[PDB]
Amino acid sequence: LAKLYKVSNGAGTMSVSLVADENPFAQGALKSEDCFILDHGKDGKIFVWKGKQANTEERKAALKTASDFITKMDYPKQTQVSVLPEGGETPLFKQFFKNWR
Ligand SMILES: [Ca+2]
């Protein structure tokens, strides 16, 4: 099962927190103020979703963390993080969500 993480410094430190571990995810789980990491790394699918109002530190932290997941969770070494902006989501990303519209 995929997991969805929030990457945010809104609470006073940069934090990577779990927001969803049941599949499929709510489309409204993606909040424009932050970045999110969708981890389905077992088959090499890891996404960074960049909320339009996230800040530079959050974007940088989400990319670094998603890349770190490859090493720390022992995902396939050729895994490439898929980076998506809010509003530029691909079918492969949307398939993880319930009734994306
Ligand atoms: Ca934020």
Swiss-Prot record:
Coiled coil: none annotated. Gelsolin-like repeats lie at residues 21-93. Ca(2+) 4 binds at residues 33-34, 58. Phagocytic cells, platelets, fibroblasts, nonmuscle cells, smooth and skeletal muscle cells. It is linked to Amyloidosis, hereditary systemic 4, Finnish type: A form of hereditary systemic amyloidosis, a disorder characterized by amyloid deposition in multiple tissues resulting in a wide clinical spectrum. AMYLD4 is due to gelsolin amyloid deposition and is typically characterized by cranial neuropathy and lattice corneal dystrophy. Most patients have modest involvement of internal organs, but severe systemic disease can develop in some individuals causing peripheral polyneuropathy, amyloid cardiomyopathy, and nephrotic syndrome leading to renal failure. Binds to actin and to fibronectin. Identified in a complex composed of ACTA1, COBL, GSN and TMSB4X. Interacts with the inactive form of EIF2AK2/PKR. Interacts with FLII. Calcium-regulated, actin-modulating protein that binds to the plus (or barbed) ends of actin monomers or filaments, preventing monomer exchange (end-blocking or capping). It can promote the assembly of monomers into filaments (nucleation) as well as sever filaments already formed. Plays a role in ciliogenesis. Comprises six structurally related gelsolin-like (G1-G6) domains, that, in a calcium-free environment, are packed together to form a compact globular structure in which the putative actin-binding sequences are not sufficiently exposed to enable binding to occur. Binding calcium may release the connections that join the N- and C-terminal halves of gelsolin, enabling each half to bind actin relatively independently. G1 and G4 bind two Ca(2+) in a type I and in a type II manner. G2, G3, G5 and G6 bind only one Ca(2+) in a type II manner. Belongs to the villin/gelsolin family. This is Gelsolin. It comes from Homo sapiens. The gene is GSN. The chain holds residues 297 to 397 of 782 of the full protein.
